[PDB]
Amino acid sequence: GKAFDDGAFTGIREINLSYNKETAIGDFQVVYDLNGSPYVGQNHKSFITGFTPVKISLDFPSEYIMEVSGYTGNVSGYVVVRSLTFKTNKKTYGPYGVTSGTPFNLPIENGLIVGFKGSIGYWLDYFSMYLSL
Amino acid sequence: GKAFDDGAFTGIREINLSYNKETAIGDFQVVYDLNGSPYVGQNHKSFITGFTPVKISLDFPSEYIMEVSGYTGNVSGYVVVRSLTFKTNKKTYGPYGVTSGTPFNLPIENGLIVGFKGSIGYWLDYFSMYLSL
Amino acid sequence: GKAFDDGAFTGIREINLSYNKETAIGDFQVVYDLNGSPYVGQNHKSFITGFTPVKISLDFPSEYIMEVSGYTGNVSGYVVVRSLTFKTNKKTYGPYGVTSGTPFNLPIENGLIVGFKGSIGYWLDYFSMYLSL
Amino acid sequence: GKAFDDGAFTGIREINLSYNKETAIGDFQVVYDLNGSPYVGQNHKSFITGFTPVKISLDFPSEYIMEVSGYTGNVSGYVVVRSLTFKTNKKTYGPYGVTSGTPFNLPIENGLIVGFKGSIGYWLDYFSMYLSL
Amino acid sequence: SGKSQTVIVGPWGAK
Amino acid sequence: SGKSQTVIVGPWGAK
Amino acid sequence: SGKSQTVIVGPWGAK
Amino acid sequence: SGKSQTVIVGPWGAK
Numbered sequence: 001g002k003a004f005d006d007g008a009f010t011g012i013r014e015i016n017l018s019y020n021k022e023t024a025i026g027d028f029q030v031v032y033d034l035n036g037s038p039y040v041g042q043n044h045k046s047f048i049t050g051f052t053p054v055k056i057s058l059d060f061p062s063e064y065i066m067e068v069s070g071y072t073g074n075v076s077g078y079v080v081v082r083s084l085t086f087k088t089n090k091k092t093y094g095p096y097g098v099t100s101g102t103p104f105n106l107p108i109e110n111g112l113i114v115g116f117k118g119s120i121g122y123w124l125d126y127f128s129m130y131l132s133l
Numbered sequence: 134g135k136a137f138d139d140g141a142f143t144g145i146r147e148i149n150l151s152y153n154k155e156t157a158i159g160d161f162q163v164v165y166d167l168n169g170s171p172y173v174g175q176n177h178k179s180f181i182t183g184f185t186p187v188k189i190s191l192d193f194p195s196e197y198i199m200e201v202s203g204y205t206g207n208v209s210g211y212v213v214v215r216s217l218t219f220k221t222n223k224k225t226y227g228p229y230g231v232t233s234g235t236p237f238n239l240p241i242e243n244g245l246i247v248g249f250k251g252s253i254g255y256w257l258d259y260f261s262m263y264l265s266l
Numbered sequence: 267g268k269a270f271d272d273g274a275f276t277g278i279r280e281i282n283l284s285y286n287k288e289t290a291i292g293d294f295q296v297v298y299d300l301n302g303s304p305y306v307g308q309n310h311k312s313f314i315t316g317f318t319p320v321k322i323s324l325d326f327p328s329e330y331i332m333e334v335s336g337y338t339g340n341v342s343g344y345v346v347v348r349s350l351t352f353k354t355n356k357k358t359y360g361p362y363g364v365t366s367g368t369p370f371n372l373p374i375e376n377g378l379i380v381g382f383k384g385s386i387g388y389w390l391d392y393f394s395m396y397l398s399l
Numbered sequence: 400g401k402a403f404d405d406g407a408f409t410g411i412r413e414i415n416l417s418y419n420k421e422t423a424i425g426d427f428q429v430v431y432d433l434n435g436s437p438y439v440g441q442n443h444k445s446f447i448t449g450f451t452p453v454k455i456s457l458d459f460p461s462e463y464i465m466e467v468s469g470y471t472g473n474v475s476g477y478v479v480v481r482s483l484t485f486k487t488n489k490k491t492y493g494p495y496g497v498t499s500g501t502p503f504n505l506p507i508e509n510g511l512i513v514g515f516k517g518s519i520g521y522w523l524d525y526f527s528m529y530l531s532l
Numbered sequence: 533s534g535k536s537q538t539v540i541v542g543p544w545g546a547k
Numbered sequence: 548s549g550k551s552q553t554v555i556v557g558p559w560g561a562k
Numbered sequence: 563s564g565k566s567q568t569v570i571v572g573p574w575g576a577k
Numbered sequence: 578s579g580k581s582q583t584v585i586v587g588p589w590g591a592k
């Protein structure tokens with residue numbers, strides 16, 4: 001898939017992703033906070049369409065992500081991120097996608113997610129996160 | 134179980150843990166690096182005995198942990214860390230313990246594990262890690 | 267004077283300031299690097315005019331600031347930053363302004379200047395810097 | 400002089416230095432905090448004697464250093480740190496030594512001094528500080 | 533306060 | 548809170 | 563170099 | 578490498 005790297009920012013304001021309850025996660029785009037100002041990240045899109053869009057608006061700066069979990073699995077022979085869930089200090093968003101395969105979760109005692117990077121072909125191949133104090 | 138918190142250091146030199154191939158992880162103790170000098174961490178022990186000791190000596194500072202994975206599961210009704218695996222840039226140590234339950238993994242693209250904290254009763258109840266550049 | 271705070275970024279690409287060889291530093295504006303892309307910072311201007319503009323284009327990312335020095339002094343009864351000098355790993359820019367008053371210097375063994383904040387009335391009243399690895 | 404590098408720690412608890420009101424700073428030794436426990440740093444001593452000892456006990460962890468200032472000057476043809484002053488959020492300790500030469504100051508808006516490194520011959524030749532969140 | 537902090541991920545295991 | 552922080556040295560000049 | 567770095571965890575998914 | 582690093586300002590004094 002096509003790789004992407006948004007880099008790091010001051011925080012996260014909104015997350016826009018899409019999925020298919022039969023395959024995996026599709027598009028991914030984030031609206032970060034850049035020193036108090038909204039910064040619209042580049043929209044990373046799937047090579048195909050047919051996904052269901054989902055918008056996750058966070059109550060910045062009082063609401064922030066505390067944990068990220070999901071499933072990675074096999075789809076058409078490719079290992080991809082099939083499901084994703086974002087738990088903040090105020091609410092839980094998801095799961096989105098197919099909750100099948102091998103689970104993974106990232107709880108954060110101290111710190112913030114300040115950036116995303118990954119790859120997207122037909123689906124989200126993989127992703128990593130930037131952590132900061 | 135009894136909680137522990139080693140705090141943060143300059144790096145990791147050696148890890149000493151024990152396990153039982155039928156239950157879960159038992160004792161945990163780390164020898165950290167404190168600005169070029171070995172620092173022997175406190176040995177956190179299980180309330181019981183019967184575990185198999187394992188020593189993981191790392192080639193500090195050229196060898197460091199890149200990923201930590203394992204399984205959390207149910208043992209006598211308590212949720213504990215049943216298995217643990219340390220993958221460095223030179224070797225893979227483990228799995229140690231029972232590879233059964235729900236999996237978790239922490240891959241690190243950029244950064245180092247500089248400290249451990251957790252809890253131990255009969256078994257390692259849970260644990261967290263300090264990350265640093 | 268009117269306070270400003272650019273926040274933090276990935277690095278510094280260009281610095282645009284003005285001064286008067288009789289008074290002190292006037293305008294201040296920086297073009298930061300935001301994850302590989304130029305980010306034009308807000309231009310913080312003096313309440314008055316008559317300054318000499320100076321552009322400091324750095325050879326990003328191979329050239330970075332290693333030390334910042336200057337003088338703070340008294341002008342019309344206000345304590346301000348009268349002079350400023352930026353020494354990179356490739357060249358020295360300045361001094362700019364009046365080299366009179368009490369000196370200050372910030373050498374950096376390890377780390378980068380990733381942001382500026384301060385205040386500007388007729389002159390640059392004061393400033394602080396964001397440091398990062 | 401002989402160089403030293405204490406490395407980084409969790410914080411500062413006590414500082415023990417000596418000086419001569421005619422020359423400059425002599426001995427330097429720090430008692431750091433290592434994850435809640437006092438850690439006695441190595442005592443870096445002057446090649447000569449005749450200094451006046453000074454102990455700066457900080458009310459750790461409610462009291463921390465906010466600014467460090469002093470003077471660097473010429474003594475017997477060697478450039479050294481002639482004076483030093485530590486200003487915390489509760490008190491100002493010093494100046495200690497001779498307040499003559501070129502001044503320097505390090506005010507900290509956000510962050511902590513977690514370590515010292517430098518060199519000492521007859522006097523403190525120079526020093527640097529570790530900063531951390 | 534005067535205690536240095538650092539990023540911490542976890543915990544994994546018992547809630 | 549949800550705002551990332553970083554080390555800041557200064558200020559220099561008017562106190 | 564002159565590029566600021568930060569901690570990065572992952573990736574999860576395709577290796 | 579496996580050694581943790583941190584910001585360092587200075588030196589002040591002899592060149």
Ligand SMILES: CO[C@H]1O[C@H](CO)[C@H](O)[C@H](O[C@@H]2O[C@H](CO)[C@H](O)[C@H](O)[C@H]2NC(C)=O)[C@H]1O
Nearest residue numbers: 134135209211212213253254255256257258546
């Ligand atoms: C056999 O029980 C003992 O060992 C298990 C597994 O390691 C737990 O650590 C038990 O601790 C208790 O755990 C509870 C949650 O599962 C809760 O924290 C209890 O307060 C705690 N009690 C004690 C005495 O540690 C441990 O007893």
Ligand SMILES: CO[C@H]1O[C@H](CO)[C@H](O)[C@H](O[C@@H]2O[C@H](CO)[C@H](O)[C@H](O)[C@H]2NC(C)=O)[C@H]1O
Nearest residue numbers: 400401475477478479519520521522523524591
């Ligand atoms: C009296 O000389 C001795 O003390 C001074 C002042 O503290 C210096 O530390 C001298 O060290 C020498 O300093 C030179 C630069 O000023 C240079 O580094 C020399 O290599 C160094 N020599 C030694 C033996 O330390 C110190 O001798």
Ligand SMILES: CO[C@H]1O[C@H](CO)[C@H](O)[C@H](O)[C@H]1NC(C)=O
Nearest residue numbers: 001002078120121122123124125
């Ligand atoms: C059908 O394959 C494509 O999609 C895969 C999965 O998300 C992978 O991303 C795979 O790399 C990509 N192939 C190319 C050439 O980009």
Ligand SMILES: CO[C@H]1O[C@H](CO)[C@H](O)[C@H](O)[C@H]1NC(C)=O
Nearest residue numbers: 267268344386387388389390391
């Ligand atoms: C003549 O004064 C003004 O300029 C000063 C110096 O740079 C100071 O910035 C001073 O605060 C500012 N006054 C106001 C009201 O902004």
